[PDB]
Subunit: 123 residues, 3 copies
């Protein structure tokens, strides 16, 4: 069991870790659109989707892996009208074989975020 932590990803203040590695499996925390250096949400849905992917990418790298190792991705959106935009931006972060995934429209997200995503990595 390993705590995965990178200062390239937003600081984890509170009782949780950016990710926990257990055996070959890395359980990554939900990432919201926080700019790590300012700890404020970036403005705009495309920038927020992109920031969540950058944050998850930073954690995956700290775990000695990459998006190629992601087996499952959960997508949480306050507005599913933006789901096609998530699909589009993913083309810039993923390629075959793609992760399994779930996507739901939620009522609200921490800090007023429009998008949050978590994932499971298998090294």
């Amino acid at each position: 069991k390993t705590v995965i932590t990178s200062d390239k990803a937003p600081a984890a203040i509170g009782p949780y870790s950016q990710a926990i590695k257990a055996g070959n499996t890395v359980y990554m925390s939900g990432q919201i659109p926080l700019d790590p250096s300012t700890m404020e949400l970036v403005e705009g849905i495309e920038a927020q989707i992109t920031q969540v992917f950058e944050n998850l990418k930073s954690v995956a790298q700290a775990a000695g892996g990459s998006f190629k190792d992601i087996v499952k991705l959960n997508i949480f959106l306050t507005d599913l009208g933006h789901f096609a935009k998530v699909n589009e931006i993913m083309g810039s972060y993923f390629s075959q074989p793609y992760p399994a995934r779930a996507a739901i429209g939620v009522a609200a997200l921490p800090r007023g975020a429009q998008v949050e995503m978590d994932a499971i990595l298998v090294i």
Copy 2:
């Protein structure tokens, strides 16, 4: 690592796989009430719930397993006033030992779906 694809489940169009098998653990994508041949949602809640289970069943069979191997299932409903019905129909697809599960009321689901479910299977 292995990509799981059932030609009986709805086609995965876009950046995801129906399921990803990593060792003995199969991470299955969320399934919505899509009729695989028409790629349109079936009508009415009972039909939708049933279609989701049928879709997950196809993916489970493609993974070389069955509902008996599912260890966790997530239920996403736009209206929990439909929970009695998900429970009833679920009882008809699973038997002891029953899987672990979570259930939440969401604001919305892809394509205006009334229900979405994902699962984890262990061979």
Copy 3:
């Protein structure tokens, strides 16, 4: 594979088990704020958060583990204004290394619960 059942956790009514242990990994069902003895929800947000943690703890103990073995926790709240209180109460139930977690605002929860949480445990 093993069914985990704690008689200190709310009875599982329906087609589910409180938790399933497969190998070294335990997949735990979402717990809501039910008082196991009355099957009624405890009242007040702090009590509800505490009861869900107590319910997961009971289930974790029956799986041969504890909160130290939790690698991922999912928090579902109908009102995220209650997130700070979840954080505070959670700090009393966990110690470093802390688990990974996700937290979302949902439209509704079973039985009118204000909070629900599920978790994954990896036993040594």
